[PDB]
Write a protein that binds this DNA or RNA. Structure first.
Lengths: 372, 82
RNA sequence: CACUAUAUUGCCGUUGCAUUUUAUGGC
């Protein structure tokens, strides 16, 4: 293959590669293995020259498939000492895009292979820092590895993702580091790296508000909402008083789609603060979620009220009943303040009257006399 | 290109645990309110379907590779006893 | 009723625009 590459018909070379793939595709090499380092380096140089020649496209894919089948023990032990020896960044990125697919097909037996390769991949992520494509590919690969599964490797990958997220200031790198922090929050929901959600809100949500059509907000705000909901779903009581900025981002996320935003709101509703939502919704209902008047958070403000009014109201809501009827009075008073689309204002007033009827059914006899 | 493909891949990997799909403002509000009623879905059933499909592919690959290792052990014991 | 206002045919063959237009014959 290197002789043909140093030589370079093209369709003749493609037919030669397809005949090579149909000839080579194995267990002969497996019976040779089970010397060994020489065979690993020989198949690694074969695969590296194969990617340098192929980095008729389906014929090149079949040749790479035969090379990946013959050359995840072998695919891991080849690249583990050659993740620096892969010279060009294009060959490195193609090798990383093949290695995760060849690795995450089967697992659950050999944990220590990935547990000692995770430090190597995180060091390759820290060394190849000026290659953003390789950085995002390493982020996706390490996130898939943490979803497959090691405390030192977990802390190293989490710190690399936190440093790739906090000082990111780049669209694709920030979106990729947010996914790595999300998968690490799903795997090891540690209390450490406390500067995680407070950095993500004021960084990414404000950046998506500042970038109107320049950046991919359809690629940014959805992942930001999923990360903000997954963090509070993992650590419930650690954000039982810090939920207001999360609800503000999930409500004013105009880039987020309707079903995704509704699912995020439902997850935040069934999440923490079963009583502390009545002391939380009032600030957004006064200042935040009622000054927009572009229907986006207007569809969701009454839904966020109805969630805690029809799924969480209890004796704790009877104890905190004053803010409940206070928010009811503010909602019934803001009708003329909502001065756009008066028929929709009447529809929202009907929804507010129904939620107020539910709150009045929840409120008992002695609890509402001063409220009366 | 590859940037958009990897972005959609990371987005779908994040929303894999979400299982979601992907001016008459009174109609928009009523549709968004009834979507809370429609949100009682069978996402646990579809996640069980995807998880059973992944378990099936994992068991298929593991059984095929273990049979390949059995043939490797038979060939190595043959070439050893020879 | 008042609003909100949202911005030729199941298939197949045709006249004809300064996109519609238009009447025929195969299941």
């Amino acid at each position: 293959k290197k002789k043909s590459l140093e030589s370079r018909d093209y369709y003749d070379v493609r037919r030669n590669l397809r005949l090579k793939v149909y000839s080579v595709l194995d267990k002969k090499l497996i019976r040779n293995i089970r010397v060994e380092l020489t065979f690993s380096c020989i198949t690694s140089q074969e695969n590296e020259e194969a990617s340098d020649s192929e980095t008729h496209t389906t014929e090149i894919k079949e040749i790479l498939f035969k090379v990946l089948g013959n050359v995840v023990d072998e695919f891991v032990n080849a690249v583990l000492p050659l993740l620096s020896t892969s010279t060009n960044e294009d060959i490195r990125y193609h090798l990383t895009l093949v290695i995760g697919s060849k690795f995450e097909l089967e697992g659950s037996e050999a944990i220590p292979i990935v547990n000692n390769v995770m430090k190597v991949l995180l060091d390759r992520m820290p060394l190849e820092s000026k290659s953003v494509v390789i950085s995002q590919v390493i982020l996706n690969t390490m996130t898939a590895l943490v979803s497959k599964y090691g405390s030192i490797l977990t802390q190293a990958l989490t710190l690399a993702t936190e440093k790739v997220s906090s000082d990111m200031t780049e669209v694709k790198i920030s979106s990729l580091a947010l996914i790595t922090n999300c998968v690490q929050v799903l795997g090891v929901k540690s209390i450490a790296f406390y500067p995680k959600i407070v950095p993500p809100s004021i960084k990414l949500f404000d950046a998506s508000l500042a970038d109107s059509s320049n950046p991919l907000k359809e690629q940014l705000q959805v992942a930001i909402l999923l990360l903000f909901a997954g963090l509070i779903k993992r650590i419930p009581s650690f954000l039982m008083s810090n939920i207001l900025d999360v609800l503000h981002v999930i409500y004013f996320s105009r880039e987020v789609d309707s079903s995704i935003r509704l699912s995020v709101i439902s997850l935040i509703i069934e999440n923490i603060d079963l009583k502390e939502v009545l002391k939380v919704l009032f600030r957004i209902w006064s200042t935040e979620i009622a000054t927009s008047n572009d229907t986006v958070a207007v569809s969701l403000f009454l839904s966020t009220l109805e969630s805690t009014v029809e799924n969480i109201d209890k004796k704790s809501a009877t104890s905190q009943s004053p803010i409940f009827f206070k928010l009811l009075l503010s909602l019934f008073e803001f009708r003329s303040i909502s001065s756009f689309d008066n028929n929709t204002i009447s529809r929202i007033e009907a929804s507010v009257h129904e939620i107020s009827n539910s709150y009045v059914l929840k409120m008992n006899d002695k609890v509402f006399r001063p409220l009366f | 290109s590859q940037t958009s493909k990897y972005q959609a891949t990371s987005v779908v990997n994040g929303l894999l645990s979400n299982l979601l799909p992907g001016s008459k403002a009174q109609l928009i509000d009523r549709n968004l309110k009834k979507r809370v009623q429609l949100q009682n879905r069978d996402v646990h059933k579809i996640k069980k379907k995807c998880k059973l499909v992944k378990k099936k592919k994992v068991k298929k690959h593991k059984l095929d590779k273990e049979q390949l290792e059995q043939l490797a052990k038979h060939q190595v014991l043959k070439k050893h006893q020879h």
